[PDB]
Ligand binder design. Sequence first.
Ligand SMILES: *[C@@H]1O[C@H](CO)[C@@H](O)[C@H](O)[C@H]1NC(C)=O
Ligand SMILES: *[C@@H]1O[C@H](CO)[C@@H](O)[C@H](O)[C@H]1NC(C)=O
Ligand SMILES: *[C@@H]1O[C@H](CO)[C@@H](O)[C@H](O)[C@H]1NC(C)=O
Ligand SMILES: *[C@@H]1O[C@H](CO)[C@@H](O)[C@H](O)[C@H]1NC(C)=O
Ligand SMILES: *[C@@H]1O[C@H](CO)[C@@H](O)[C@H](O)[C@H]1NC(C)=O
Ligand SMILES: *[C@@H]1O[C@H](CO)[C@@H](O)[C@H](O)[C@H]1NC(C)=O
Lengths: 327, 327, 327
Amino acid sequence: RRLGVLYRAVQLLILLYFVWYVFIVQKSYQESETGPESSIITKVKGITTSEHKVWDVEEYVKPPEGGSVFSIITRVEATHSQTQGTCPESIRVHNATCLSDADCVAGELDMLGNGLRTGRCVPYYQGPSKTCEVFGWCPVEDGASVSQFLGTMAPNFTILIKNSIHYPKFHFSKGNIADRTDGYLKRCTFHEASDLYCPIFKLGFIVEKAGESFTELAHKGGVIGVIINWDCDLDLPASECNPKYSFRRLDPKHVPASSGYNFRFAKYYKINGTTTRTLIKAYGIRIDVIVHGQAGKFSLIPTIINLATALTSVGVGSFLCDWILLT
Amino acid sequence: RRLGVLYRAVQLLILLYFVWYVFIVQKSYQESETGPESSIITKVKGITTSEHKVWDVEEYVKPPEGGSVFSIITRVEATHSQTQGTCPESIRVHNATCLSDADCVAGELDMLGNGLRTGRCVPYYQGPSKTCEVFGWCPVEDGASVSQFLGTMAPNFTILIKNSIHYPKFHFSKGNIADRTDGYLKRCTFHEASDLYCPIFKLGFIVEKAGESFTELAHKGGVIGVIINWDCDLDLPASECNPKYSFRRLDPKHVPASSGYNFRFAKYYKINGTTTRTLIKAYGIRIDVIVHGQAGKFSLIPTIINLATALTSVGVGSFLCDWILLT
Amino acid sequence: RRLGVLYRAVQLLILLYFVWYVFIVQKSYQESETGPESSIITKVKGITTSEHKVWDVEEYVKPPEGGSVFSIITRVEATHSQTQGTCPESIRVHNATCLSDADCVAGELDMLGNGLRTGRCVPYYQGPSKTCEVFGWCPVEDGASVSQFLGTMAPNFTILIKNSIHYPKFHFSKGNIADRTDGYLKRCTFHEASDLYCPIFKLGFIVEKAGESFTELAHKGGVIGVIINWDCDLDLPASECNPKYSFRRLDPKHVPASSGYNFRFAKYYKINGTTTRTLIKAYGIRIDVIVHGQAGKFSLIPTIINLATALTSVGVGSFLCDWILLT
Ligand SMILES: *[C@@H]1O[C@H](CO)[C@@H](O)[C@H](O)[C@H]1NC(C)=O
Ligand SMILES: *[C@@H]1O[C@H](CO)[C@@H](O)[C@H](O)[C@H]1NC(C)=O
Ligand SMILES: *[C@@H]1O[C@H](CO)[C@@H](O)[C@H](O)[C@H]1NC(C)=O
Ligand SMILES: *[C@@H]1O[C@H](CO)[C@@H](O)[C@H](O)[C@H]1NC(C)=O
Ligand SMILES: *[C@@H]1O[C@H](CO)[C@@H](O)[C@H](O)[C@H]1NC(C)=O
Ligand SMILES: *[C@@H]1O[C@H](CO)[C@@H](O)[C@H](O)[C@H]1NC(C)=O
């Protein structure tokens, strides 16, 4: 009687749970593939100015080739006319300060120093201190570097990411630009809803979507990641598989020591037969384009496994009801 | 009687379906791992010529280091003796054409322009038009660039990809060159059957296997991906795990706007104390080596799950036959 | 009687096997995700010396930007004052040796040669042999290169890897540096137990943990991979997810032909209006930072599938016991 009503209510509850959670919500009827094959072609385009200098893309984008990882230099500390010679050590180098020649040890190369110590105390670049003389690339950066801010109009720089994926097991291939001939990429601006196949992003848009302040991320540097997630359901048509662009800062923005991004490169010249160089310490924003994939397609093996599990679970509910009735 | 024959025929049909499709075909008795750890070492080697110039690998391969992504330059547009100064704007820049000084706005920096506008109309490099004067790197590329075709013998360039994978969960590690001392790599040519452990590919072979035409992909540029798939069955010996090299074009070859690959780099010089440069716009073929993995090894958990599913399915066939007989 | 004891012993054996192997050992109650999103920021810092030259990071680290793949140059073969002209071919080029002008074919460009053959026999750089004259970058490397060993103090170079992962499906994100303000990274040394969030590694430590000898890996070059495995169990707190750094050599160290790492880059100058260059062949150790992920979190679907399998298996044991008793 009523025992039958409760007995069948348990079965319906178990079947509901399976049909909803296991199948509709979690798609246990589906087999999944992750890690597609991606191709990223980037192209930064924009020009900026300094006190009397004009910087083009060749100057502030390293490396020049358009790939997943590139750095947009927003500030430089250039040390011009560096030659191999003898000069005072940087005041920031461990026990570089000296009062006499006895305080400097000859032939001492510090790995964090700027050269091999000559062994005699020399006046610093700006008085009145005295630092141990070193042989290396001179003058040192910490004594003869001039800072230039490039990124006054870095926010208006535009980056064009060209992505294309492929899912081998499911034979799915797609890109992030629509095959058109209407002059679209020459006048479009990215919008996650209106214009999703115009992957031309301003640097300022990327930074603000990452939650970052451009001045702080430009003076000290930073790393911002442009993440493309192709969470794809292959039972739906190919027009239902779209790229989702997320922006987030990838460097340890909270650790004071490791926050920032910078690197050194030099420009090499022969002046009167002697090799001179211009050491440039570049602070800038590195853009990493990370592509992530998660596909899904209906597979019969998972479906039958879960159906068998549902039947066994309904049987276990049967056993539980009978056991409660007996006791 | 005959009901028994049909009843057991249903069981045999269900068991066949499982034993064939679930186990033999799909290998549901197996656990899978994807995404191994890969190491790619590339080395392009070949020399080409121009009207009176000889180009070596250092000149047309960027970046010089041998990694997954590199570009082989097939054509350049070099603008020599570029200095920071004032010169006419490119005729391709928005509203650069002027008839008088009033048509040029002083201090206007266009992000797609080639400098900061001085504010006075100047004659173009070739008459009779007049363009707004700009301050930047001068002369501009669109007025003083000379094109040189490098890739006359690019098809005979040879790329040596050195790959090595590792599957952590299954403790499988392999490479794409056989440990030999017979002078093999100095005289071998790749063949997907005869010579699969001689990964020395001519650029023309890669292009033709990608279905591309070398002249069009060399003048305008392109991106070709060398895909290595280690679809591996670990129940078989290690000699049964082999690399499969596939070649396909990765750029949007159909979109007119985004088809092609190019980038700019410059050579910097000091001439009479003033920084001059040679801006080179390089059109070439980028080679991406993409390594994809899918391993499989027999695991007891999937086997028992599928066996339980088979037994439950045979029981469901039993129930269906009995239900048909009753009704 | 005793049949009951054996009958229930079989059930307990099957249940033990499941509860131990399927659940406790293999964690079949868990769903897994692999392939997180990684960000790698490297920074090599150290200075070395030669006979009379001091080398800084800008000189021996290529590329300058701090990413996953970079090369630390330990030895160079620099060919200075290379200009486009005519010079003897390298004695190592196929049939380059000549006895008279008839042995040289005019206009012959060998892809493995160093230029276009002029067609007349010229004396070699060192006597008494004679090689076919070529037009290219002259003098050739095999005749005018000078070797300098940089890596006397390469083992004391320190590399700072900055990693940060993210698991999308499980919403887990972590890095490899602890958020601190105690001046930790300026004085810490990595230890896999004591100091795991100080990812500052000496090059010598990386090499010795890889099992390599620094002198051989420095003269000839090599590739060493720094592997970070985030094998993560998400049922445990976030303090229980840690990076595991493994070091191994990635190049074919056993194949004599393919063992080693080297590349060429040049320094370009204008001398009296003619383009000269310094071709540098760099032998060094390439560091690849490979990040691998394997997360796990309790999921109800696998748990119920395995519980149903356990019940079915106990039933199959029931059937086997009854069948043995009947026969
Ligand atoms: C630095 O030099 C001073 C004076 O020569 C010496 O007392 C001190 O120990 C040195 N510090 C080192 C070597 O770390
Ligand atoms: C450049 O970007 C800034 C902020 O990102 C914006 O205020 C400014 O209007 C932009 N420039 C132009 C010409 O729109
Ligand atoms: C270009 O300049 C012309 C004349 O100064 C002006 O009419 C036009 O609006 C300008 N186009 C712009 C600013 O996009
Ligand atoms: C170079 O390649 C082209 C086509 O790829 C071929 O026709 C030619 O014979 C090759 N050169 C040599 C010397 O074999
Ligand atoms: C090299 O040159 C010699 C003499 O000209 C010739 O006999 C030989 O066949 C050549 N080898 C080649 C072209 O591989
Ligand atoms: C540099 O490293 C070597 C071995 O890696 C070691 O013997 C030497 O002591 C180190 N240098 C210093 C100053 O500790």
